Amino acid sequence: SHVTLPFYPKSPQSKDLIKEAILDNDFMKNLELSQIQEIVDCMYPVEYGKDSCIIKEGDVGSLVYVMEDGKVEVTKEGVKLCTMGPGKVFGELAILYNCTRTATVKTLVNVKLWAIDRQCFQTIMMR
Amino acid sequence: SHVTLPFYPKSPQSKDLIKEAILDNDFMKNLELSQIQEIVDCMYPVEYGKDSCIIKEGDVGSLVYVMEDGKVEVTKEGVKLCTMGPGKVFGELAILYNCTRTATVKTLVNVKLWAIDRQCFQTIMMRT
Ligand SMILES: Nc1ncnc2c1ncn2[C@@H]1O[C@@H]2COP(=O)(O)O[C@H]2[C@H]1O
Ligand SMILES: Nc1ncnc2c1ncn2[C@@H]1O[C@@H]2COP(=O)(O)O[C@H]2[C@H]1O
């Protein structure tokens, strides 16, 4: 008996965008392509209106995100670090390294995201 | 044709302690019992004194460790990330994410560890 990872059907554009977002991320870019494929398939969609706090610094984290549409701002202790648009990963640090969120992430406009949780991610790492 | 993995004889007591540390690990929980047993068999003992740097961030990582005794401190560019005590695994990230060491690991007291090299660990993961 092995657990079946949930599959979320996606458009090819979406799959390409997720794959390129991972390959753009310094910390995830070296994962096997086969693992990236499984991450792509397991990611599920989530949506936020503007001025939404997706991630609060210091919280425990469960999800890594890929941005499909929109723009976020990353701040730490009130200080703007950057902004991110489509094709970018965020919220990966807590999941990769098992720490609390290292920064806060808010939406500047509406956003569409893809998300995958640690548990699913770690299973994929072990295959 | 097929690599024979090293076997390191160990007391039953040590096998148990290593098995527990592995079963306590997020990633390692995913493995089959038999793979976990094979990891236990491939591990070999290594010790470090107080104030040793076992793992330096940015290096190539070819070893995964279980800590039997002792306490260790994890840093990144000088900044304390956390500490880890007995029964914990460390050094698995470089292997699992296929990258250089993501943090620096220094001993806070004398430690006693078990180590498995990357070849064995990956071989065992492949052999489901
Ligand atoms: N200095 C930075 N520059 C760009 N993004 C950052 C920076 N610091 C933190 N982040 C992002 O903000 C996220 C907050 O949650 P995480 O710590 O899980 O992962 C973090 C990164 O994705
Ligand atoms: N918060 C952390 N960030 C990065 N590595 C950590 C952290 N906490 C513990 N570690 C361990 O530090 C190890 C350093 O080598 P690795 O990157 O191979 O594997 C890493 C983890 O096992």
XYZ file of C-alpha atoms and ligand atoms in Angstrom:
299
model
C 0.000 0.000 0.000
C 1.462 3.294 -1.064
C -0.297 6.569 -0.910
C -1.598 7.961 -4.121
C -0.647 11.583 -4.645
C -3.597 13.751 -5.753
C -3.470 14.929 -9.354
C -4.682 18.366 -10.514
C -5.354 18.669 -14.289
C -3.773 21.808 -15.710
C -3.364 23.528 -19.016
C -0.020 23.054 -20.769
C 0.679 26.760 -20.300
C 0.233 26.341 -16.600
C 2.495 23.303 -16.463
C 5.197 25.198 -18.404
C 4.925 28.198 -16.121
C 5.201 26.095 -12.955
C 8.157 24.120 -14.349
C 9.973 27.298 -15.340
C 9.235 28.888 -11.964
C 10.886 25.973 -10.177
C 13.864 26.022 -12.566
C 14.186 29.744 -11.864
C 14.376 29.196 -8.119
C 17.931 29.002 -6.744
C 16.919 26.478 -4.086
C 14.720 24.174 -6.172
C 16.316 24.364 -9.612
C 18.460 21.251 -9.146
C 15.602 18.828 -8.452
C 15.135 16.002 -10.919
C 12.884 16.749 -13.865
C 10.787 13.735 -12.940
C 10.252 15.246 -9.488
C 9.442 18.622 -10.959
C 6.841 16.906 -13.149
C 5.249 15.334 -10.084
C 5.253 18.674 -8.312
C 3.559 20.299 -11.322
C 0.857 17.624 -11.307
C 0.272 17.853 -7.552
C 0.029 21.620 -7.382
C -3.469 22.947 -6.890
C -4.947 26.367 -7.568
C -5.711 29.089 -5.057
C -6.728 32.725 -5.433
C -6.419 35.985 -3.506
C -7.910 39.450 -3.934
C -5.616 42.467 -3.641
C -4.339 43.652 -0.246
C -4.416 40.108 1.079
C -1.817 38.735 3.411
C -0.895 35.362 1.976
C 2.103 34.735 4.252
C 2.942 36.334 7.593
C 6.564 36.363 8.820
C 7.268 34.114 11.776
C 4.327 31.808 11.153
C 4.659 28.109 10.633
C 4.350 27.257 6.926
C 2.731 24.355 5.031
C 2.562 25.485 1.393
C 4.946 26.542 -1.352
C 3.451 28.794 -4.031
C 3.896 29.496 -7.707
C 2.519 32.692 -9.127
C 0.492 32.472 -12.323
C -1.072 35.947 -12.417
C -0.603 38.989 -10.276
C 1.969 40.779 -8.176
C 3.023 40.378 -4.545
C 5.198 42.415 -2.252
C 7.637 40.772 0.146
C 8.417 42.629 3.340
C 10.415 41.779 6.431
C 9.737 43.791 9.553
C 7.933 46.411 7.510
C 10.797 46.767 5.047
C 10.074 46.041 1.397
C 12.444 43.384 0.095
C 11.021 43.072 -3.425
C 7.936 42.325 -5.488
C 7.212 39.205 -7.569
C 5.166 38.580 -10.696
C 4.107 35.482 -12.685
C 6.633 32.658 -13.024
C 8.084 33.106 -9.538
C 8.157 30.667 -6.604
C 7.558 31.919 -3.056
C 7.000 30.459 0.405
C 9.477 27.710 -0.421
C 11.937 28.461 2.449
C 9.764 27.170 5.322
C 8.958 24.018 3.389
C 12.473 23.315 2.112
C 14.266 24.057 5.347
C 11.665 23.545 8.043
C 11.784 27.093 9.474
C 9.053 29.634 10.175
C 8.241 32.061 7.387
C 11.238 34.347 6.868
C 9.157 37.215 5.477
C 5.662 38.531 4.855
C 3.977 38.324 1.455
C 0.966 40.463 0.469
C -0.944 40.844 -2.792
C -0.667 44.151 -4.639
C -3.412 43.134 -7.084
C -5.570 40.037 -7.419
C -3.441 36.934 -7.850
C -3.785 33.378 -9.084
C -1.428 30.845 -7.533
C -0.463 27.198 -7.569
C 0.265 25.489 -4.263
C 1.650 22.228 -2.890
C 2.095 21.217 0.755
C 5.234 19.943 2.534
C 3.858 16.479 2.987
C 3.253 16.036 -0.708
C 6.581 17.687 -1.545
C 8.541 15.421 0.809
C 6.935 12.280 -0.540
C 8.061 13.355 -4.005
C 11.568 14.001 -2.678
C 11.723 10.365 -1.488
C 10.853 8.825 -4.872
C 26.724 -5.449 -12.628
C 25.273 -4.344 -9.246
C 27.120 -2.527 -6.440
C 27.366 -4.402 -3.125
C 26.649 -1.848 -0.396
C 29.039 -1.742 2.573
C 27.909 -3.475 5.762
C 28.933 -2.082 9.151
C 28.386 -4.443 12.140
C 26.739 -2.670 15.075
C 25.141 -3.611 18.390
C 21.373 -4.187 18.327
C 21.105 -1.211 20.650
C 22.745 1.053 18.046
C 20.618 -0.317 15.233
C 17.560 0.609 17.281
C 18.690 4.115 18.054
C 19.483 4.748 14.364
C 16.157 3.242 13.260
C 14.358 5.574 15.694
C 16.160 8.679 14.432
C 15.338 7.795 10.836
C 11.685 7.114 11.651
C 11.569 10.493 13.370
C 12.687 12.263 10.200
C 10.129 13.956 7.909
C 11.563 12.553 4.695
C 12.700 9.208 6.028
C 9.221 8.356 7.341
C 8.328 7.852 3.675
C 10.630 4.858 3.238
C 9.699 1.211 3.550
C 10.876 -0.528 6.701
C 13.238 -2.674 4.627
C 14.894 0.390 3.103
C 15.299 1.828 6.568
C 16.967 -1.375 7.709
C 19.362 -1.183 4.749
C 20.275 2.357 5.721
C 20.919 1.251 9.286
C 23.311 -1.406 7.962
C 25.222 1.055 5.733
C 25.883 3.567 8.496
C 29.299 3.858 10.098
C 30.432 5.603 13.275
C 32.155 8.959 13.380
C 32.822 11.281 16.349
C 33.654 14.990 16.567
C 34.884 17.080 19.466
C 33.302 20.248 20.824
C 33.612 23.251 18.505
C 34.011 21.285 15.277
C 32.554 22.272 11.922
C 31.084 19.083 10.505
C 29.318 20.622 7.529
C 30.108 23.955 5.868
C 27.458 25.723 3.769
C 28.264 25.769 0.070
C 30.301 22.565 0.062
C 29.483 19.465 -1.918
C 27.453 17.104 0.254
C 28.161 13.378 0.083
C 27.156 12.272 3.615
C 23.982 11.947 5.714
C 24.209 11.778 9.509
C 22.306 10.504 12.484
C 23.275 12.044 15.796
C 23.503 9.531 18.597
C 24.879 11.794 21.352
C 25.553 15.489 21.491
C 24.294 18.834 20.351
C 24.886 20.768 17.169
C 24.237 24.287 15.888
C 22.994 25.170 12.413
C 24.021 28.531 10.955
C 23.703 30.421 7.689
C 26.136 33.224 6.941
C 26.946 33.480 10.645
C 23.308 33.568 11.687
C 21.985 30.968 14.123
C 19.207 29.008 12.423
C 18.627 26.415 15.128
C 20.182 23.635 17.151
C 19.723 19.882 16.973
C 20.116 17.190 19.600
C 20.310 13.402 19.775
C 17.986 11.296 17.639
C 18.006 13.730 14.746
C 19.137 13.427 11.155
C 21.083 16.167 9.431
C 22.874 16.600 6.117
C 20.072 15.083 4.049
C 19.065 18.269 2.224
C 22.043 18.541 -0.147
C 21.338 14.966 -1.168
C 17.578 15.221 -1.534
C 17.571 18.620 -3.299
C 20.654 17.772 -5.376
C 22.568 20.873 -4.228
C 25.442 22.135 -2.086
C 25.153 22.206 1.695
C 22.438 24.684 2.583
C 23.721 25.487 6.065
C 26.725 25.182 8.362
C 26.692 22.627 11.172
C 28.980 22.962 14.198
C 29.206 20.888 17.376
C 28.314 22.539 20.687
C 29.534 19.575 22.706
C 31.321 16.358 21.835
C 29.075 14.398 19.488
C 28.789 10.801 18.423
C 27.320 10.282 14.942
C 26.445 7.715 12.316
C 27.101 8.426 8.644
C 25.871 7.004 5.356
C 27.406 8.144 2.138
C 25.305 9.496 -0.743
C 25.842 6.525 -3.096
C 24.366 4.061 -0.588
C 21.531 6.265 0.461
C 20.449 6.944 -3.127
C 20.887 3.314 -4.151
C 18.610 2.321 -1.302
C 15.980 4.877 -2.305
C 16.010 3.608 -5.907
C 15.641 0.009 -4.760
C 11.946 0.118 -3.825
N 15.179 38.753 0.492
C 14.132 38.117 -0.278
N 14.023 38.355 -1.563
C 13.014 37.752 -2.288
N 12.110 36.884 -1.650
C 12.227 36.640 -0.323
C 13.197 37.212 0.386
N 13.088 36.794 1.686
C 12.017 35.937 1.761
N 11.485 35.835 0.545
C 10.307 35.025 0.175
O 9.322 35.231 1.175
C 8.891 33.930 1.620
C 8.239 33.930 2.967
O 7.934 32.579 3.296
P 9.207 31.675 3.241
O 10.162 32.023 4.302
O 8.634 30.138 3.287
O 9.900 31.759 1.758
C 10.164 33.133 1.550
C 10.645 33.527 0.163
O 9.889 32.874 -0.850
N 16.787 25.873 9.140
C 17.734 25.137 8.322
N 18.109 25.575 7.152
C 18.994 24.832 6.390
N 19.497 23.610 6.873
C 19.107 23.168 8.095
C 18.253 23.882 8.824
N 18.018 23.233 10.003
C 18.763 22.077 9.981
N 19.437 22.020 8.834
C 20.373 20.945 8.447
O 21.628 21.505 8.108
C 22.148 20.678 7.043
C 23.285 21.279 6.275
O 23.604 20.402 5.196
P 22.372 20.089 4.294
O 21.970 21.262 3.524
O 22.817 18.820 3.360
O 21.171 19.479 5.216
C 20.922 20.467 6.194
C 19.883 20.118 7.249
O 19.970 18.739 7.589
